[PDB]
Design a protein around this ligand. Structure first.
Ligand code: HEC
Ligand code: HEC
Ligand code: HEC
Ligand code: HEC
Length: 107
C-alpha cells in the first residue's frame, strides 16, 4: 500500500482542478475511494486511462464528473453522496462540503 499523500493533491477535470485533502478523510477506509478493480487493489488516479477517463461527459461510468458528483445510487460512494450524509449530521458544513460555488472544493 503506497503512502497516503500528506498534502492536498490535484483532481484534474477537463477545465477545473479541485484540490483533495486526505487528512479530513482519515476515518474513511482507503477502499471506499480507491476501490478494488478486478479483485485487485489499486491506487491509480481516478482519471487513469481505462478507468474514469471521460473527463467531459456528465454521465456514465467512464465519466470522472459523475463518479465525483452523482448525488447517490452508485456502486461506490461519490464525494457528493457521502458529503450529503455528513452535512445532514453537521449542517454548518453544507456550503463547505456540497456547494457548487464558494465551497471547499470550488472556492
Ligand atoms: C455543485 C453540486 C457542484 C457543481 C454543479 C459542480 N461541482 Fe465539482 N468537482 C469536484 C472535483 C474533484 C472535480 C474534478 C474532477 C471532475 O469532476 O472532473 C470537480 C469538477 C467540477 C466541474 C468541472 C468538470 C471538468 O472540468 O471537466 C464542474 C462544472 C463542477 N465540478 C460542478 C469536486 C466537487 C466537490 C467536492 C466534494 C463539490 C462540493 C463539488 N464539486 C460541487 C459541485
Ligand atoms: C476518498 C474520500 C479517499 C480516501 C478515503 C483516500 N483517498 Fe487517496 N486519493 C483520493 C483522490 C480523489 C485522489 C486523487 C485521484 C486523482 O485522480 O488525482 C487520491 C490520491 C491518492 C494517491 C496518489 C495518486 C493520485 O491519484 O494523485 C495515493 C497514493 C492515495 N490516494 C493513497 C491513499 C491511501 C493509501 C488511502 C488510505 C489511507 C487513501 N488514499 C484514502 C481519494 C481518497
Ligand atoms: C481503473 C483501474 C480505475 C481506477 C484506478 C478507479 N476506478 Fe472507479 N471504477 C472503475 C471500474 C471499471 C468501475 C466499475 C466496476 C466497479 O468496480 O464498481 C468503477 C466504478 C466506480 C464507481 C461507481 C460508478 C458507477 O457507475 O456506479 C465510483 C463511484 C468510482 N469508481 C470512483 C472512483 C474514484 C473516485 C477513484 C479514484 C480515487 C476511482 N474510482 C479509481 C475503475 C477504476
Ligand atoms: C465519506 C465516506 C466521504 C467521501 C467518499 C468523501 N468525503 Fe470529503 N469529507 C468527508 C468528511 C468526513 C469530511 C470532514 C467533515 C468534517 O466533519 O469536518 C470531508 C471533508 C472534505 C473537505 C473539506 C476539507 C476542509 O476544508 O477542511 C473537502 C475539500 C473534501 N472532503 C473533498 C472531497 C472530495 C473531492 C471527495 C471525492 C474524491 C470526497 N471529499 C469524498 C467524507 C467524505
Amino acid at each position: 500500500a503506497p503512502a497516503v499523500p500528506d498534502k492536498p493533491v490535484e483532481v484534474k477535470g477537463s477545465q477545473k482542478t479541485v484540490m483533495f485533502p486526505h487528512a479530513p478523510h482519515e476515518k474513511v477506509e482507503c477502499v471506499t475511494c480507491h476501490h478494488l478493480v478486478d479483485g485487485k487493489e489499486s491506487y491509480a488516479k481516478c482519471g487513469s486511462s481505462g478507468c474514469h477517463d471521460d473527463l467531459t461527459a456528465k454521465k456514465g461510468e467512464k465519466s470522472l464528473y459523475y463518479v465525483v458528483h452523482a448525488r447517490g445510487e452508485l456502486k461506490h460512494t461519490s464525494c457528493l453522496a457521502c458529503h450529503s450524509k455528513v452535512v445532514a449530521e453537521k449542517p454548518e458544513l453544507k456550503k463547505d462540503l456540497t456547494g457548487c460555488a464558494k465551497s471547499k472544493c470550488h472556492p
